[PDB]
Amino acid sequence: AGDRVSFDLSVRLRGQPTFGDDRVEGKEENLKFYTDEVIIDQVRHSVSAGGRM
Amino acid sequence: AGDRVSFDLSVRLRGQPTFGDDRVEGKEENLKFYTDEVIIDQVRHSVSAGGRM
Amino acid sequence: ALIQSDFAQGIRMTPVPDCAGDVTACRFDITLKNAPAAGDIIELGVLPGNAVPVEAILDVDDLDTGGAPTITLDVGIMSGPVGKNDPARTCGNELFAASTVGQAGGVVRATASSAFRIQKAEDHRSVGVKVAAGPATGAAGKTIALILFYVQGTS
Q1: CB distance A13–B47 less than 8 Å?
Q2: Mind giving me the DSSP string for C79-127?
Q3: Do C16 and A26 lie within an 8 Å CB cutoff?
Q4: H or E stretch including C73?
Q5: Does C16 contact chain A (CB < 8 Å)?
Q6: Cβ neighbours of residue A38 under 8 Å, at least 6 residues apart?
Q7: What span, in angstroms and rounded, lies between the C-alpha atoms of C42 and C131?
Q8: Which of C85, C97, C135, C149 is placed for a possible disulfide with C71 were both Cys, Cβ 3.0 to 4.6 Å?
Q9: What residues in A contact C18, CB-CB < 8 Å?
Q10: From CA A22, how far away is CA A15, in angstroms rounded?
Q11: Chain A / chain B CB contacts < 8 angstroms
Q12: After which residues does chain B break, using C–N > 2.5 Å?
């Protein structure tokens, strides 16, 4: 049951490496997730066949 | 345990050969080399999986 | 009108403490390719979630050129998500109340009673200076910096 489904993209890691012996603990790139959503509605149509005349 | 590597190039032998029966004991070419060095270092980077919430 | 520093696009990440009460500071800086003009919102630094500012030196170069300078900078917790690149962002003056630094390259500390009392939110927020009053005629490429002694895990 639902009228909306959301699916995510995990973008690449962009950052600066720590050259030499510079301490890296505590400087940790956060994974960036991007979101999107699609919504569902009905689409109906009807045709008529006249009468008995 | 090393921080830099120094490889070598053995350039060709060049000189004038001694034609005939002329004695050859001092007209000896010398092996000349060339050197280049490469310096190593450390890179690293880290990503944080997040909290427990 | 958004100047996204390297610390907001994700090019350079910010340090977050691995404990409670352990202060943390990082020099959020820009190299302004253009010259500051009224209305610019210089997104310079991000304040990590569950962290609150504790002390903040704002250090800028000489942003004026002529006499009687009038450039004023205010620093606040910008509302939008990090690195949105959207002019609709609001900014504010929670950290600095229209600081007079920029008329001469100098160092100012958080002299306001609201900079030290800032609530925390579980999501990253971007700290960005805004040029409230337009600078006097004349400017050039200069480095605006703002170190931000924030601590995580308060109560």
Answers
A1: yes
A2: -SPTT---TT-----SSEEEE-TTSSSEEE---STTTS-----SS-EEE
A3: yes
A4: strand C73-78
A5: yes
A6: A4, A5
A7: 8
A8: C135
A9: 25-26
A10: 15
A11: 35
A12: none
Q: Residue C18: how many CA atoms within 13 Å on its side-chain side? A: 6
Q: Both tokens of residue C11? A: 């090019």
Q: Which residues, in sequence order, are bridge partners of residue C96?
A: C75
Question: Chain B partners of A17 at a C-beta cutoff of 8 Å?
Answer: 43-45
Q: Do A27 and C10 touch (CB under 8 A)?
A: no
CB atoms inside a 10 Å sphere around CB C78: 26
Q: Which two tokens stand for residue C61?
A: 């170069």
Give A19's contacts in chain B (Cβ within 8 Å). Answer: 41-43
Instruction: Give A4-42 as a DSSP string.
Output: EEE--EE---------TT---TT--EEPPEE--EEE---
Q: Is the separation of the CB atoms in C47 and C127 below 8 Å?
A: yes
Residue B7, both tokens: 């490889």
Report yes or no: A34 and A9 within 8 Å, Cβ to Cβ.
Answer: yes
